[PDB]
């Protein structure tokens, strides 16, 4: 059958599913990883032993469990984030949607969540792969892995929680996926791979890892890259977080056997209930448990092997959203509300440049402070709104990415960089936020297709100009079929916007902002703090 | 006799002089202090003992001993300021240019020049006080004051070479206008002191230092204040430089007293052709011989005297040009010329910002790139020189002045500020140049006024408003005439922070002069450099 196939570990069958007026396959819930359970909480992923009979794959699985956000209750801007499974350890599956009729050894997009890595599901609507899958035609693959202290608590030396198991966890995922896709119609050799924020970010840490690059072709980063501030910390600050953890749940303390058994013990809720409490400052886009550069999945420092070129040679396509850090400022800033057009007076700015560069001393606060406020008209609440809401997005998201875009394309195969700055017209945001972290996550996987979810023309035009531009790409390495997308280099470095306008060409995106982040802002740090 | 005068030293007798189809007195060379002379180089001044007879004031005195520019022999545009009278170390003399008929008890303006404490002169033709003083009818003077080495070497501690002399001599200047002025129909009550540059400086300076206080009323300061940071510098960098000057004369460096010794026995010129070797690193506008913060002519600190509002309280008048760094870009920066657009490339620019703030470490160097670079277009020549000359003139007199105005502000009694932003007609200088330092000076003496020089009618209007906000100014503490139809200079407040523009243009009434930069250069980048 069609729906029957026959895996590696065994047999799955799949479901039909309508799309478009029109259906295709979709597999859901398949395992690639025995549940991380018991003795197996903080521990490398195990592959899936084999199964008999056949798997029913018909229906999404769990969520990891995962901080759950109840700011805004009934509110569909931020409940379309949060888990709409069952919550549990038991989570590590993945899904797969195949063109029907079945194609022979298409092109294969792995999709991975972003969430800060304390977050994220692969059962999102927002992440359902039939409109891409179908419209593009090429094998839609979502994986999951484990978040929060489940997928990075990082007590290195040990080998009951090592940390970055949760980058394991893709990993595990992109291996089935080399050995599995082709009974599914995938061609293992041409499979790309893209996530957006800690997805993104996730994608960037394959391409450094070796581990990791045999296991994909290309990659696209969205809103994301490796050398992000919050995407990583040393294995000491991993510790004393893993210690703080322990702390705060009355654990023994007296060796990482006693610490980890005794948070083995503990309720899943448990652990997350007191997550946020190990982060060493007050602060805004920073998150407790998170990759570690431990020297095995990571050989060297992040910095070094974008220098020496030690990493993954071949072609990427990445780029930012126009407004990344209002999402954060609403949650975390003074000031800010979603229900006003929160201006921001002088005190409360000089409060959320504190909360935005929490490592900075007060010269690093002073350079961030003069860097971007208009001394002509200090007082005006909205330049001081968007003053603050660019610091964010420049230093959590669009420099660090720029930083890796120059670094990656000296030694790299192809660039092509975008900057999505279209604010969808049906969002449910205030306008003040702008085109939001995440917003353009709907244009790639061609939700403004469907009719009922009332988006424009023109903005099903872009979604669909886009689901071209990823899925051309992932075919052949450019985004362009043969308005043509530049390729970005170290002399020009050309880059496109992405909206309802017609294709324009820009250079150097916030070159300005990025040398003060990139290279002035470390250096008064390193000289000072 | 309208043109003899007695005075409290003995008789003077002064000059008839045409001026704009009349004629005016003129008392040129009436010294007022004795001659700086052998044992005396590097001593405060003395009061001018007693004459006997008429003194000739008919002509110009000598100009000091100073550093002489050639850079562009034949050059009209820097020939200007050259001493145009011989140089002798006789040279503490003031100029008097009364109305007439003689005035009762009009009001004095005495006029300090700049030139960056090591040259200047009080006969150069921009300082012809015979326009201003027939058109405003005002009593103008214009003093002297030794420069370089001869005015302010310092070897704190020691009572021949104290330093800050050369202040002295202008204090002298001014206690002698005190003293003398009623008799030429001046009110010594009414002096207004003003002075460009480092004569700006200086004007400031009185303003800071108690034993100067009592000698003027109030204040005009253009394109200069006290505390820049090439107007002064600590006791020890003074002692430093003063050694250094011995040492690169080959003197006996074993006490203060055999290195004056030396020092006193070397030729003018001697001192003068080593005067720059003394400086601590390779830069521009920095100059060797300034005053030094003594705690003497100075109680305390520039910053904390300011801040304590330690100071006279009065009404002041200042502003600067739209190009200040120009002038010293040309002289010693790599790129320019006063013969090519002058576009920089990068590598000059860095060399410029390096030079332009020699002080500052690599970080620092950093935070003024990052500041003055567009980084979308960092090789546009252009760009980078026009940034290159903010730096220099951001740095060097905008802020420093900016800070001033600011800090006198919460004390003073009313503060005005303008922007000057002209460029004169009849400019030798190349248009990169924009608005050159001093330049502003020929309106205010009203230069414009006289046909022969080809200004603009435009262009004498201009120095006609110039010279009435001048006098008008000195006259009562306010540039404006009280209701009057013509548009009014507001006063400068510490919450609207408002300022003119000067030029031939209606007045602009504008805010915050150059606030960004300004909060860079008075707050951040001394932070950055304090840190370590
Ligand atoms: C798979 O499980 C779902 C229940 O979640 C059920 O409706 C469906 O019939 C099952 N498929 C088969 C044939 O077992
Ligand atoms: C990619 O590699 C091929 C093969 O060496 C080379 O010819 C091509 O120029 C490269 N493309 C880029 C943009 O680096
Ligand atoms: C004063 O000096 C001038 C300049 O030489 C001369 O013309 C004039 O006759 C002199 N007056 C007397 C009384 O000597
Ligand atoms: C100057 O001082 C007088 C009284 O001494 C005061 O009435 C006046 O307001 C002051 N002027 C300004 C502008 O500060
Ligand atoms: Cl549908
Ligand atoms: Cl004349």
Known sequence: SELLVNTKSGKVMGTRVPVLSSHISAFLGIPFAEPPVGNMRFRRPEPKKPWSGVWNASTYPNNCQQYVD?????????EMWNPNREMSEDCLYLN????????????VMVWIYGGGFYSGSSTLDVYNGKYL??????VLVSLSYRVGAFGFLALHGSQEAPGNVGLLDQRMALQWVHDNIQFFGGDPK?????GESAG?????????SPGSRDLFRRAILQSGSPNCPWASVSVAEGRRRAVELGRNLNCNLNSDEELIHCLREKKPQELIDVEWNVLPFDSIFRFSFVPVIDGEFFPTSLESMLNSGNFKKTQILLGVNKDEGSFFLLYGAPGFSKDSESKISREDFMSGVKLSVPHANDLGLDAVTLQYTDWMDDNNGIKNRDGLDDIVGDHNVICPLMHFVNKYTKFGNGTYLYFFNHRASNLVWPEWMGVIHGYEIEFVFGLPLVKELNYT???EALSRRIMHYWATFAKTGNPNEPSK????????????????????????????????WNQFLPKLLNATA
């Open 96 to 107: 797969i949607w195949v063109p029907s009729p079945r194609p022979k050894s298409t092109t």
């Open 70 to 78: 109840e700011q805004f209750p009934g509110f569909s801007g931020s």
């Open 200 to 208: 993104g970010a996730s994608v960037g840490m394959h391409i450094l």
């Open 485 to 516: 997308w530049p390729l970005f280099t170290t002399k020009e470095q050309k880059f496109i916007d992405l909206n309802t306008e017609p294709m324009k060409v820009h250079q150097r995106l916030r070159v300005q902002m990025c040398v003060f």
């Open 190 to 194: 041409t499979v790309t791979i893209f």
């Open 457 to 459: 023309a023109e903005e």
């Open 133 to 138: 899958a179908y419209t593009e035609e090429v």
